[PDB]
Design a protein around this ligand. Sequence first.
Ligand code: NAD
Ligand code: NAD
Ligand code: NAD
Ligand code: NAD
Ligand code: 641
Ligand code: 641
Ligand code: 641
Ligand code: 641
Lengths: 268, 268, 268, 268
Amino acid sequence: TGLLDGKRILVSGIITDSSIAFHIARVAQEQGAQLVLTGFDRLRLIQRITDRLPAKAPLLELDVQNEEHLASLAGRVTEAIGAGNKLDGVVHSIGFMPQTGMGINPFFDAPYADVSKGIHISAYSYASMAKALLPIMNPGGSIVGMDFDPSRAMPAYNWMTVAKSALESVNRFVAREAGKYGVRSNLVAAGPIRTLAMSAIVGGALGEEAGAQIQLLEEGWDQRAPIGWNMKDATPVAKTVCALLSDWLPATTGDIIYADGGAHTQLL
Amino acid sequence: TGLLDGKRILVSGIITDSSIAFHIARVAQEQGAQLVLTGFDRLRLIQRITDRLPAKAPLLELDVQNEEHLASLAGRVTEAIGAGNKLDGVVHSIGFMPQTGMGINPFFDAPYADVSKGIHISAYSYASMAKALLPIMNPGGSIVGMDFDPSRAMPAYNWMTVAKSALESVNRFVAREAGKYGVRSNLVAAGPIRTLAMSAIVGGALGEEAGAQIQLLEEGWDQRAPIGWNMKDATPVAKTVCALLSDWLPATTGDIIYADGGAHTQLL
Amino acid sequence: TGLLDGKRILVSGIITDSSIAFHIARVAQEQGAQLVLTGFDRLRLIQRITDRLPAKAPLLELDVQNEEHLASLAGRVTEAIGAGNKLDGVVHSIGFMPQTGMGINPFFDAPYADVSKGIHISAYSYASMAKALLPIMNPGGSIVGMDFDPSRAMPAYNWMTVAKSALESVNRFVAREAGKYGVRSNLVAAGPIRTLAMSAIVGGALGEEAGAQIQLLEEGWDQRAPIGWNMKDATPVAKTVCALLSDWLPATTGDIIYADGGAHTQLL
Amino acid sequence: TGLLDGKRILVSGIITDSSIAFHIARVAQEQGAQLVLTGFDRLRLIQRITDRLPAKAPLLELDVQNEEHLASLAGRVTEAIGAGNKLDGVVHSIGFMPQTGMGINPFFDAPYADVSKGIHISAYSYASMAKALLPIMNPGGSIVGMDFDPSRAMPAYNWMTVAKSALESVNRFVAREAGKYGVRSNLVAAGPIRTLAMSAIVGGALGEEAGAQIQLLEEGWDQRAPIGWNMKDATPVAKTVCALLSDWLPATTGDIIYADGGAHTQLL
Ligand SMILES: NC(=O)c1ccc[n+]([C@@H]2O[C@H](COP(=O)([O-])OP(=O)(O)OC[C@H]3O[C@@H](n4cnc5c(N)ncnc54)[C@H](O)[C@@H]3O)[C@@H](O)[C@H]2O)c1
Ligand SMILES: NC(=O)c1ccc[n+]([C@@H]2O[C@H](COP(=O)([O-])OP(=O)(O)OC[C@H]3O[C@@H](n4cnc5c(N)ncnc54)[C@H](O)[C@@H]3O)[C@@H](O)[C@H]2O)c1
Ligand SMILES: NC(=O)c1ccc[n+]([C@@H]2O[C@H](COP(=O)([O-])OP(=O)(O)OC[C@H]3O[C@@H](n4cnc5c(N)ncnc54)[C@H](O)[C@@H]3O)[C@@H](O)[C@H]2O)c1
Ligand SMILES: NC(=O)c1ccc[n+]([C@@H]2O[C@H](COP(=O)([O-])OP(=O)(O)OC[C@H]3O[C@@H](n4cnc5c(N)ncnc54)[C@H](O)[C@@H]3O)[C@@H](O)[C@H]2O)c1
Ligand SMILES: O=C(Nc1cc(Cl)cc(Cl)c1)[C@H]1CC(=O)N(C2CCCCC2)C1
Ligand SMILES: O=C(Nc1cc(Cl)cc(Cl)c1)[C@H]1CC(=O)N(C2CCCCC2)C1
Ligand SMILES: O=C(Nc1cc(Cl)cc(Cl)c1)[C@H]1CC(=O)N(C2CCCCC2)C1
Ligand SMILES: O=C(Nc1cc(Cl)cc(Cl)c1)[C@H]1CC(=O)N(C2CCCCC2)C1
């Protein structure tokens, strides 16, 4: 009776128990999905974290900047879910920008090598992952990535904003490719969520001014949101990702669904 | 195990078995919802049509231009669902524009009295219905209306486009009010669906040029849509409305969900 | 050497010396335009006000809700500018919403007759004026209307927001008609300008909460604007309207130009 | 009496007599601007081409991927225009994407090193150029870049679309920096212009299917445009850039002006 009963779904992006992807994985399992997880670099950590999920899920290594990892990924997934089985869903919950590209470091002072690394991981990899996994996805399947609305500039987010603008564009092209397989591609634009790192940035890890600006952003977001916004609760975001992974948004692709309390629809 | 198990939902807008609202009502009942229906003017017809739905549903009269109908509506709904029970969902699937405001009649030749009637029924009534029903809606509830993307002009749709632009604005304000009740408000922007009337317009009911332009629109829509678009199948639209009525998009309000095959994300 | 040398331009919307249209008219005359003015209801007042413009300009009566005024307008304009001469530009600087539709009166409590009057004057009349004047406009000509960005909801602006959403849609259709004459149609979306009435609303004319919200809006607008925003200075808006009336934006139509300090491009 | 009388403007991006920047430079000189030009790699060619401009203009070498060129640029400009003089305008008319990232090569088959080079030149360099030149720009000045509307996906444009989405984001952040200097930053989103290279792509240089799709795009663009679109005429685009360089859009920044015949406002 679960929303995702019988579905096989790959979830990337878990690194702590506060990762948005941890909550996506939890809700998906509560709703009957069978998962395969991917993790970057710290696999012992990630295994220990994902031991706390409701059900067992194989963990595979994936550095999206590593061409060998991407080239072997479909085979490794198929080994984990069984020959003759394919995926019904893929969750991209991956982002990175060097400190030069976010925070109080001036916008103009980010070297391109740093910006390029952030765009590789945060935007191009959405296409890389789709390339690798579409050949082992079933018709009716769904690829979902995580977005933070970049349509307006904001303090401190700087080149990560630019990376998210690129991601939104990439998603519209991935939809064209995915459609050939009967697969949808969409982003969920979430409101601000207090992951470990965000509390770190609020405590000043990227400069005092950036932390101050994020707290103002958070406060304004809840004010503007007609149904409010709880930055400590990723579950509403996770539910939205599961909606897109389900059979219930079958005519939506190349698109952005806003799980943000409605804040982006209100000026003040 | 239905998506809408236990939910009480009001559905407006059925007039034929090809009405988008007929399919919304059908899918909602398949998913366990208990419905109350509203109909305009031809109640004997509408009862005979809705006899074909999977389950029984009380039918109430509602002309959204009639202030007495709106003032009595909540009481009549409560009588139908039982004292002490409230609604969890409301579907607005209502639209109208006089022939002077659509088709081959020149854009400049639509008298304002005609445009005003179309905007009353197609846009203002979304607010009227929310005003009437929010006092008998439960927290966590959902109001959904039907949209046809008006962000660009198009042939023949003329003042109905303007009415839909107004509706989109109205929805953002209804979200502000609905949030006070813990209720969401959203639109579903559907691709073109061949209702009775649309085949009528294709057969030339509003002029030959308008019918020709609609057929070109339909053809282009399926071409652009990365997953295709079947104008003869309202079920994907109905499923999307049910997704918004469910618990699975809990952080989305004041917003527009596109159930259009992804066509609006592609230029060609 | 003026930007608008030799051009004949109709300017509507002057009612006080703080009207945005007064400043449009002033700047247009400084730049060599020959004007015809239209005014509503208080023609003795408007004549006394426009006596202060740099140059003489005939004043014609125009109530945009009056069909007889609209039907005679082109003939009256031609009489004022001389047989055989046509207009090169038209400025629509007209808006109205009854107090029930703006301010602290609840959104749901605005009667449709009031909303309909506001939409007639604020949105439909953009089409009415184009219908009346396109037959006496020269190729290369330009129609400009005034907008306040309605893409997100905001406190108190309420049904005027809805009217501006309608206007934006109307403009895209007027562009289709105007193009047949070689004429452009565009809106200028201005930041908040302290007209007489706005100081009145700040002093509480539409309720204390509305005045408080407008002051917060004004303050936020200047903060967000990368080049700042001076609500006491309409000249930057007037210059932008003159740019659209000129020969220098010849490939822009159906569009919106933002003269708002850049505020709409920034979240905070 | 020229629109840009007395203004000192840097124009990048000339490589042939069909370059959009060649036409920007020509119109700017016709309107009284004093120019400094920058060129990439083929300076003998570019000098011979720009000999045909109405007036003399110093040519400086600038490879935007070359950090030494960027670090010396302001000094070289100041030498060319005279100590104590500053720029009033900067035109970025620079774009590049390797063949793997455009045309018929599959979207998924573009290596990131190629995409990264295209984003460096086409998007990041807008920030690089602003960083280099803002210290020698006057208050009231204007930075303009060239855009091709990337809000929807399209055939063949592929990763260049993604680069333009990034550019639009970069422009909103450059506006924040430029505002500190009293300088505006905006993009002009042009319709398709038949430069040398575009005729090359139509003749099949990036594959037959891509050429076919571009011809369909061009045809549709003129159809949709309410005032038509002439792909052989860059002058309307050049005029629009000059409007933004002028004093007549003083409250517009972080924004996009569409010089596209109005096509983006029309669905069909
Ligand atoms: N936290 C928020 O406020 C917020 C808001 C909206 C969207 N998002 C997005 O949600 C997603 C998840 O972010 P989060 O806040 O949960 O943070 P997180 O740090 O928990 O997740 C980011 C993940 O990216 C992974 N990653 C980094 N480099 C990688 C590489 N080379 N290969 C593979 N994976 C790599 C990290 O290991 C980590 O698991 C990101 O796309 C982020 O931009 C976050
Ligand atoms: N058919 C499409 O291509 C399409 C596409 C997108 C959105 N829509 C929208 O979907 C909704 C339903 O349209 P449909 O195509 O199913 O057509 P339909 O004719 O079946 O439904 C329109 C309904 O509006 C009702 N209505 C008209 N005047 C009314 C009044 N005074 N009071 C109450 N109800 C009144 C009619 O009785 C009818 O039931 C409308 O909002 C329409 O604009 C339709
Ligand atoms: N003031 C701002 O903050 C602001 C911001 C953006 C846009 N605007 C828009 O600019 C325009 C001018 O507004 P303003 O602030 O200068 O106020 P204003 O009161 O000076 O101008 C409004 C004009 O509309 C006229 N009008 C009203 N009913 C009319 C009718 N029946 N026929 C003809 N004219 C009629 C009034 O006589 C008046 O001249 C309006 O469209 C307004 O919505 C204003
Ligand atoms: N042609 C169109 O249809 C069209 C439409 C909209 C926007 N645009 C944009 O207009 C701009 C100019 O394009 P165009 O069509 O005139 O083509 P073009 O080839 O004439 O201009 C592109 C320029 O970029 C320069 N460039 C490339 N690499 C460079 C580097 N490393 N450093 C400095 N300069 C470098 C080239 O030398 C050339 O002068 C580009 O941004 C393009 O994306 C073009
Ligand atoms: O960083 C975030 N918000 C934020 C940061 C700053 Cl410096 C300013 C603002 Cl306004 C918002 C949120 C949104 C986002 O994409 N992430 C990512 C999490 C993974 C590493 C890169 C950043 C966390
Ligand atoms: O009319 C429609 N499409 C359409 C019509 C025309 Cl004339 C042109 C175009 Cl492009 C599309 C579709 C979309 C829409 O809101 N309805 C409404 C159905 C109820 C009565 C008013 C119109 C049916
Ligand atoms: O009213 C205005 N701003 C405003 C009002 C309110 Cl109540 C709230 C907010 Cl946020 C902004 C500005 C913008 C606008 O269209 N006008 C119009 C001026 C003419 C009469 C109708 C209103 C003045
Ligand atoms: O390439 C163009 N259009 C185009 C190409 C393709 Cl392959 C498809 C489509 Cl739809 C449009 C136009 C738009 C654009 O940014 N340039 C750039 C010119 C300089 C080199 C990189 C491309 C030329």
